[PDB]
Amino acid sequence: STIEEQAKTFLDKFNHEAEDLFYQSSLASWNYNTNITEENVQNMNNAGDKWSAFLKEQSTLAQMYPLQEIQNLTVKLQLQALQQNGSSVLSEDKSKRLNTILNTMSTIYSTGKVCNPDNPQECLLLEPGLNEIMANSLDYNERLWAWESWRSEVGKQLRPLYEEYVVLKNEMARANHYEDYGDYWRGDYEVNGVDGYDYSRGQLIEDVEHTFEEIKPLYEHLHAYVRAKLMNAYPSYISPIGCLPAHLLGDMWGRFWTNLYSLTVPFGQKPNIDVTDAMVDQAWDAQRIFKEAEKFFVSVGLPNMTQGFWENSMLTDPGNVQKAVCHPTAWDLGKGDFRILMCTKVTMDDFLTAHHEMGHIQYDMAYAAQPFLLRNGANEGFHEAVGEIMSLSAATPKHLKSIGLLSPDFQEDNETEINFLLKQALTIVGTLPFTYMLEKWRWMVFKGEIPKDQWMKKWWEMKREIVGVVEPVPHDETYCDPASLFHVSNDYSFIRYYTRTLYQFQFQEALCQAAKHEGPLHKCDISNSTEAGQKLFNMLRLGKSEPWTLALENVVGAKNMNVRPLLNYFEPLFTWLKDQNKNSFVGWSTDWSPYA
Template identity: 65%
Template sequence: MIIKFHWWNVTKYIYSSLEHVMANSEDYSERLHVWEGWRRETGKKMRPLYEDYVDLKNEASKLNGFKDYGAYWRYNYETIDEDPLYRYTGDELMADVRTIMPLYKELHAYVRARLMEVYKGDIDAEGPLPAHLLGDMWGRFWTNLYRLSIPYPDKPDIDVSKTMVDKGWTELQFFEEAEKFFMSVGLYEMFPNFWNNSMLTKPTDGRNVVCHPTAWDMGNREDFRIKMCTKVTMDDFLTVHHEMGHNQYQMAYRNLTYLLRDGANEGFHEAVGEIMSLSAATPKHLQSLGLLAPDFAYDEQTEINFLLKQALTIVATLPFTYMLEEWRWQVFEGNIPKDEWMKQWWEMKRELVGVAEPYPRDETYCDPPALFHVSGDYSFIRYFTRTIYQFQFQKALCDAANHTGALSTCDITNSKEAGTKLREMLELGRSQSWTKALHTISGDTRMDARPLLDYFQKLHDWLKADNAKHNRMVGWNPEISPYLKNQIKVRLSLKAALGDDAYPWNDNEMYLFKANVAYALRQYYAQWNISHSFTSEDVVTTPWTPRISFYLMVKNPETLNELIPKDVVVAAIRLSRARINDAFQLDDQTLEFEGIIPTLASPVKQPVEVWLVVFGVVMGIVVLLGAYLIFSGIRERKKKPAKATVENPYDETAEGQTNKAFEEGDDEQTGF
């Protein structure tokens, strides 16, 4: 299925056709078409707006006493307390990233290997993952990769989406079951306004709405709502628990003064929603709802399947979140200039996340605002901190519920003890620092990734063993591109060719180079009466090195999301090689296209003097004539009968005379 993009309808279809393609398609080109089209129709058009946004947000932040907008966001986590136990600075925020990366890299290696089986020839075994193959439009969650990477596919499916549909579950039923869960632990029944005023499914009256799930506190202590275009899937079932978790937090602190009606920090609010999802996702809870068979057995292989599914949602998103926010902070701080936004965005993505752009970018793009949270002015670090908090919360609540066994099997349903512990923390709202609120529920005063690592320990061990068994590289080489197979390396030797007359290589020369390559492509297709409007903008080059080398590739001007295959570009350059050389006063040795043999260049001839040619011809004739005479004489002698050889022809004695010519006679003759 190919979708034509138009700015006025792309938003309308993002939660239908486009989302469906990115969740389900296994067609590399179709996914690339959607991925690139979305960024061209959103990010590119938002580029000037986002540049203004950065300037204005920084200006407003400085007026409020912050050095930039990133510092303003980080202030949400800073605490000032006389007791150093509860004091916290924004510099501590990313301390847990390093502890999570070993688990992430093992997961990355496993997923890469499984995707290589689906997209044969399109993924390098040691390279980053192409960004458009990760299960959604942004590669934020890898949940939809589960069906492609399930370790033990013969085990019962723990993604119960199909069972929900088969059993006739409705969207409304999701919210009713979530409410039952909250009430079972002693939290709140939803207020009547929730059921009357929420938008729980996509309107069918033709209205265009933003479908991104959100929870709302209308500020009057009795009206709490959700806006969501719910679908009957397991993913949305868990999202409902998450969003209603926000509402539970809002209802818990509703009696505080208005300014204190908020989470202890933004990450707390997200974490509260997530701990509800952790219990709702367990096979035990799903079995209690009749979504897994009564005889369902939770054995070791099923546990690995479950943990992998959880990791694709939870672990895979952590480097994504960290890298996105780090890039924004650097942009707000001015450390990344505007003319390098995309360059450094994808360099960081490759280095930190192991994900690469599947199509060349330039500075006309602006990929980050293609994500709802970025264009919507949301701080994103909350999604990193919430993941750490949620497992600290979960461990504390499971301990309160007297859970025994692995943390991943804990379901706090019906535990009033766990609910009481949670409610005590929720009711604090923002009246206490988050370090004190965290201490209330878990006894900790700092973020700690150990509960998260404990939750996934069995999976981590399994991934290490499986990757080692199959000799997979753990990690990635950030220099490898998904489009590497279509790149051609170019080297120029201006000094060697022109000496002191060498001209400098600059942007103008690169423009001329691109124009020449575009000309070559036009000429190539013209052979078959095919008209392609190649321009210099279709020719993509990487930044050149000081010794003047760079990589070249060519976009397809007709589709705008495909690269011209390397073999076609090679053929076009060979066809116009002499014209390209002449444009730069170079030859095949000083303008080198790596891997392209100069078959169409004129033969190289050494200068030859004319007299040498004549002399050679004459000497050849003499030698041949001499040989002829020698061999013909030998042949004639062989034909005569054998007789005595006489050296002097006048020395004849047949008639008793030595030589008749000299007989004695009357006349004397004298000779000289």
């Protein structure tokens, strides 16, 4: 006769309907992903349409129960997930316009190609053209040509579309009793209810600013070292004190700095660790790699793979008879169906990717007991962090020596550790400012502090002030540079990566401390340590049923984001950089530009 009982019954019905519908959709999607055939596409389309129709029908009936009359803090989260008007607040024509504009943007981004001047019959599409050039070329004019071209052909065909996209998304956000679309995305971290763990939507900005204010010295030293080393490959293109050009960062946009290892290696004479020859000399296969990964995961006390996973999940490419999409992915079809889809080769990179995917599968398997609506991570950053901690822990030389893939007489020196630390730093430390700046610019644009005619005047201005990169050619308001990315042209958030990177090192430090480890953090293996696994389990099985602050506190011991473990992980590299660059200058000035 109350409202709580009616809400409970409604969720009870929805829980049993959604399971069957979602399982049908997921099975159809997997069947399509295995092959490439017309009837599979037809089945996938039918299943997806049915699932979307059911979800839309069930969303409407959930608004009858007021949110203020229910005090349970568990069904309230599910109702809040269901009571959300998706895009129906506006009129039908506006919704149709929004769907059309999104589809047009996606189509424009997907099928964009650039042609070499005076050669209309030779056009490349980035994967083996621009981005390949971007990743494996030491020339100067070619890199600048590709970098300017791709943006010139793509961004101007997306900017007018993006203006209407922003306007309509703001309209929908205000219709949904929010401030803007940026507030709509920041709401993922919002926690209301139980006292002592509240997290307002506006606290995220302050937390991110405070945490980033501490990373600056290490990034400054790394930037100075990279700038000093790159003056040997481009002698007359890098300022002694200026900012690094964005077209010489080994990537189309500068997201990662991994492709600069061959230019900035400290000791090129001593080789790195590569067990590919050991893998080949003992006749290893994909099954052996996967069973070794399973052994590593069971070494810490976690459960192992279900029998069906060894049957329904493909491990190697079928060949020319079939046609699949080789892309690693952990599939949770529901109702006890967990699968891995990856084409495996005998290589160390696959040896680490297997661990990453199996960590994904373990995390998915952890929270199978929770209701359907709560079967996800605490936030949008826990999942990849749990995946990556195992990958970081499994590459230690001690583990390689223990499993017999390395010579027992290989005397590990204090010179290879610097190489490994630098290689890890170039791909971990060098991406946080980029993500932070992109999210800050997007939030400022959505909020309204930046008028429509002052977009790019800020976009290149923040770069020089944060990332230390300068545009090689001037730009006007016609360009839309951020839309060239996959996560900007298509509607996707970007603050996931910063939080994931900050969480992974904190978790690693907590586990290493719990494992009674003595020495530097970079030589830590969580193998043969039960105490290092059970603690992690306390976070694995919670899911979305509890605020992310409580989940983080259950492992690390602190309820707020922290950065000290990240700097502790790179301490000897920091000392070596401090010793090396005593005769150089740290810092950058925003006055030098390549074009002026």
